[PDB]
Amino acid sequence: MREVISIHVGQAGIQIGNACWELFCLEHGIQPDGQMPDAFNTFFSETGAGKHVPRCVFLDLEPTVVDEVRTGTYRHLFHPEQLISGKEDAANNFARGHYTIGKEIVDLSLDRIRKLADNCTGLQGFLMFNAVGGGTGSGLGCLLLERLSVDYGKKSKLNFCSWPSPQVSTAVVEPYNSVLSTHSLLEHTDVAVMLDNEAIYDICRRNLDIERPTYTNLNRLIAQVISSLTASLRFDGALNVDVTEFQTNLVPYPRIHFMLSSYAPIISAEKAYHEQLSVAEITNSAFEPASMMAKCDPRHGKYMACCLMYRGDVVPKDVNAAVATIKTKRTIQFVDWCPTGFKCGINYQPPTVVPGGDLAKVMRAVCMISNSTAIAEVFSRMDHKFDLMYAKRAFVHWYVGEGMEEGEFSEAREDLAALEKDYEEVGI
């Protein structure tokens, strides 16, 4: 009972799994070998003499970034075929990942996910982590959704995307892999959390005050997002929320399932002890329209739903007071078909302290998974890049060369066009 399976694909998937499974290891007390010196059931198992194997698949067509966990300390933690690798990288090619070289590794991925689901006595969700900006994260990741939605139909599939940033790309064919991979995260995904790298850069710049953060520091905060997300699945609290209730009291009409993340007790030790990080101040920094983890301003969008996950020494009287002061402000606005728009959930477990990383010791936390119509702009910015490139048929010989017909470019743009059209239609 109470198991969730994380499914990492793409190189950013392995690295985000190195931080997330790290945090799950501390948050139940597992040593680096896999031994505690049953809250752990969602993430780890019990293999006899205290062994604790994680419930993950690390999936990549390029062996290099999955080899560093196979050669570091945690070959002995992860089961050695739960780290499925390949030979050639998909190489920023959605065609290569989805049609050509992803169709030989997809057998080992589905076989291992099946074995990781047979030892479950009631499974809540599939927390798939990926990055839609490249090759195997856009390709094989999409195909894995096609196979998962047909063998596990009733199963909910959460998905933490890493959607392309506006001015920062680190890839020039990235607009092609983003637009062409919308259909996996529109019809075969029940929760689509949209993250991008720049918003984590800004949070690290002004809140944590690391001026020059690395991707490993970006994986700090996204690890804190899933810990507060699966907080009620593992430790007791005043109000509990499971992944069935995230996708019920937050998700409107079924195509609109695109949510945004905002953790906000982000602070480091030079600031931390000078201020009261109580319930009122951490939730005002949560609704602040510069701490969104999307580079997507909510001040031109309407909040359709919000999910506050307070986590620590938080009293429910202060939660109901904090939702009052955020409801009385005009800069925060809601759709008319929403008298109640908050699913508050409290976990008694304090936020896990970060020795040697970037955060500090805080007694309470908050994370928002909020669906708004502001998210109709993270795809409009990528429309302009797609239409500019596909006007001159740029970069499309690489796609058509492995068996990706030129047709799919047009109705992937058209599918995102109906996605945009669906978003201002709700906000009328």
Binding site: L26, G29, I30, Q31, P37, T352, V353, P355
Partner: peptide, 12 residues
């Protein structure tokens, strides 16, 4: 790293 365990809260 691994943490220490929080102290048990005795009933009153």
């Amino acid at each position: 790293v691994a943490k220490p365990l929080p102290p048990p809260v005795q009933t009153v």
